Structures are given as C-alpha cells and as structure tokens.
Amino acid sequence: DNTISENIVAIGIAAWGMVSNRDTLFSAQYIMLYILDNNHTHLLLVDNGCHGHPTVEAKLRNQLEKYISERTSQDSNYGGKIPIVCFAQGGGRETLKAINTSVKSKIPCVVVEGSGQIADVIASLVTSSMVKEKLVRFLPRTVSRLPEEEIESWIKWLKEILESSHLLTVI
C-alpha cells in the first residue's frame, strides 16, 4: 500500500527447509512445508538444515543485527553507530529466544506492545513465583502443552529478560 502511494526496504529471513517449494536457477520465476510471502523486496534463506521444522535462521539474523550495531555512520545524527529497534508483539519460544539474543547485546533496545501474548506478560512484570503465576494466566493451552522443564526454562528466560529493564520499553 505504501509503495503504491525512497522505496521501502523489507528483508525477510527464513530457512530453506521450511520452504514448501524449491526452485533452482538464469533468473527463475514461479507463481504460488511453509508458504513464504512474495511481497517483500529482499528475501534470505538459511542453509543449515533441509526439510527441518526447527528454524536456524535466528542465529544468522542475530549475527547480522549485531554486526549492524557495530558500524560507522558519520552523516547520520547518531554517534557513529546505526540505531536498532526490536519489536516483539508476539509471544513464543522463538520470540523469547530472539529477545534474549538481542538483549544480550546493548544496542537492541526492545520495544513491545500490549497485545495478548507472552510479551504482554513481560510488560505486566515490569519474584519467580509471581512470574510463573502471571505466565499461567497468560495462555492456558500454551502453558498446559509446555512440559514442566520447558515451563521452568520459560520462567528463567522471562527472569533474564526482566533482569535488564534499562533497555526494555513498553507501549
């Protein structure tokens, strides 16, 4: 919609295995085990695993973001570095892993919204028993499905994220 109305730059990073259809190629064009958007200008595919449900592109994404943090920008109004912002409106294992990886670095000051998800629980939180109780009230199906060890790991991740409130902001 915006481009129909300087061009916007969108990069979508995913895993090759997750792609349902594989095309090999001069230029090759196709018309539309996970579907992929055809609207983003740029797309990247990882080469870690084939036909694997788990996604390994998160590590490459985090490495790219960290490198972007350590960059020079003189014409910009910043102090040489390029500002970075992370959005985590959704909730889940992948979202929390990305949050932890980003917050491990200082630059990725995370900003989150109020939509119903684990991010909402994180916003509400900003000890262990209270966090666990809040997580239980967040999603009954998600907490029930998660094993006890998985729930403990989730609570540990939430505590780690809350351990650094300086870099976290919530609308």
Binding site: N7, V9, I13, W16, D23, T24, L25, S27, A28, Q29, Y30, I31, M32, N38, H40, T41, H42, L43, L44, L45, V46, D47, N48, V56, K59, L60, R61, Q63, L64, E65, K66, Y67, I68, S73, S76, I82, P83, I84, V85, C86, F87, A88, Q89, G90, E94, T95, A98, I99, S102
Partner: protein
C-alpha cells in the same frame, strides 16, 4: 541456487556466511545503506 523470483530478488545465505561480507555486497549491489532499521519478531 539464487533466483530473482517474480510474481524482487532472493538469494540464499549460508549459515556459515560472514555477516560483514554479505552486508557489504548487499549495500554495494542492491541499494543504499539504512540510517535506521527495525526487526520484528
């Protein structure tokens, strides 16, 4: 093998590929640098 699917261009990136090299190639070949960026999860 990379391909310019039309229905933009997409190129597969190896997990072991260096971030610096791919970023430099992308900036030099495709478009200008970004004064700001946001990553959404």
């Amino acid at each position: 093998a990379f391909g310019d699917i039309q229905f933009g261009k997409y190129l597969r990136l190896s997990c072991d590929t260096d971030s610096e090299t791919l970023y430099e190639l992308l900036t030099q070949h495709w478009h200008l640098k970004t004064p700001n960026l946001v990553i959404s999860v």
